[PDB]
């Protein structure tokens, strides 16, 4: 399965 | 000078929770892009600027045949763009969710290149730090081209570390999930998550909770399919090392403990660069306009000085 993904920064 | 009315918006080939990538063909050479559109206004709220900046200085003055070329970056009174070259392939997220897992030695190949890419930006002291199957696209021949340098850190030489909790929630390594600083293995352990997504067709660690995730990447430890082949095993097992110490890659020679490791014994390091390996998969385009390799949740979605942001402003020679 597995959903897409997004990046973060703190 | 480069503006925003000398292309032709056809269609969007991705989105994130910042900008979106449009596909487009300049007016004057009829020569296809991938657009990449950031707004200003968040970035600047966001305090984003030095990220952005980055992606710029690492677009603009990164050379190799896995990288994602530049061919203009420009700005306008409220955006930001990029005229990338165009991956026609889509993205290996893509491939991955499609085919379910790769044979070792259609793994083999894509790792080999993501290493060679790997190796150079470590050589030009960038540590990429956002490895995943999202940021991993292929040309119209088949060849890896990294894409999405938002999160790149420049500087970084030998054991110099980052300070930045950042990059995407799977991805993450152990060190990034304790506090202080971490160094340039981090890409490494990217490198293993997704030579893991390629040959065991899961993530290594997954819940849908982020608090639970970290736990997992910090706690749990990585099994292995009883058929996947010993050097395999010893590759993802050595990437996937919690400490970046014992990683490899880890070490003081960074990509060469990687590039020596019986996985890629069949590998010679100076074909993969100069790209005399055989892709184990072309894509299958009829047109430039042919994005059957990118999802239909975004190719169906219709389209419609104080505040100068520095470093940009950018046209390539070759
Ligand atoms: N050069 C390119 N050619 C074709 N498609 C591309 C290209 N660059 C990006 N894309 C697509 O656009 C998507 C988003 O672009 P990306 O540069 O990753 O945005 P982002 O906001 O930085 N994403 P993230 O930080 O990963 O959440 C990618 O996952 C690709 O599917
Ligand atoms: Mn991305
Ligand atoms: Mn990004």
Redesign the pocket.
């Given at each position: 399965g597995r959903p897409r993904?997004?990046?973060?920064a703190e | 000078k480069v503006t925003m009315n000398d292309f032709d918006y056809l269609k969007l080939?991705?989105?994130?929770?910042?900008?979106?990538?449009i596909?487009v063909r300049e007016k004057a050479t009829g020569r296809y892009?991938?657009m990449?559109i950031?707004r200003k206004e968040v970035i600047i709220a966001k305090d984003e600027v030095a990220h952005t900046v980055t992606?710029s200085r690492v677009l603009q003055n990164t050379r190799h045949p896995f990288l994602?070329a530049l061919k203009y970056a420009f700005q306008t009174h409220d955006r930001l763009c990029?005229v990338?070259?165009?991956?026609?392939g889509?993205?290996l997220?893509?491939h991955l969710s499609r085919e379910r897992v790769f044979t070792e030695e259609r793994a083999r190949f894509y790792g080999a290149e993501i290493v060679s890419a790997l190796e150079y930006l470590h050589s030009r002291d960038v540590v990429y730090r956002?490895i995943?199957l999202?940021?991993l696209?292929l040309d119209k021949d088949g060849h890896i081209?990294i894409?999405?340098?938002?999160?790149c850190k420049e500087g970084i030489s030998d054991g110099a570390t980052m300070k930045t909790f950042c990059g995407?929630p799977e991805y993450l390594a152990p060190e990034v999930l304790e506090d202080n600083d971490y160094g340039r293995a981090v890409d490494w352990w990217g490198l293993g998550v997704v030579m893991y997504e390629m040959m065991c067709g899961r993530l290594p660690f997954y819940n849908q909770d982020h608090e639970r995730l970290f736990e997992l990447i910090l706690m749990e430890e990585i099994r292995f399919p009883r058929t996947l082949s010993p050097e395999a095993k010893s590759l993802l097992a050595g990437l996937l090392k919690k400490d970046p110490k014992q990683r490899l890659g880890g070490g003081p020679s960074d990509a060469k403990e990687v590039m020596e490791h019986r996985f890629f014994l069949s590998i010679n390091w100076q074909d993969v660069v100069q790209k005399k390996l055989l892709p184990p998969f072309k894509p299958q385009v009829t047109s430039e306009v042919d994005t059957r390799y990118?999802?239909d949740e975004?190719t169906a979605q219709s389209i419609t000085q104080r505040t100068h942001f520095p470093q940009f402003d950018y046209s390539a020679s070759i």
């Open positions: 993904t997004t990046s973060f | 080939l991705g989105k994130g929770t910042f900008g979106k990538v596909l892009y991938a990449k950031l992606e994602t990029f990338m070259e165009y991956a026609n889509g993205e997220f893509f956002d995943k999202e940021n696209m081209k894409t999405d340098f938002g999160l995407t990118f999802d975004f």
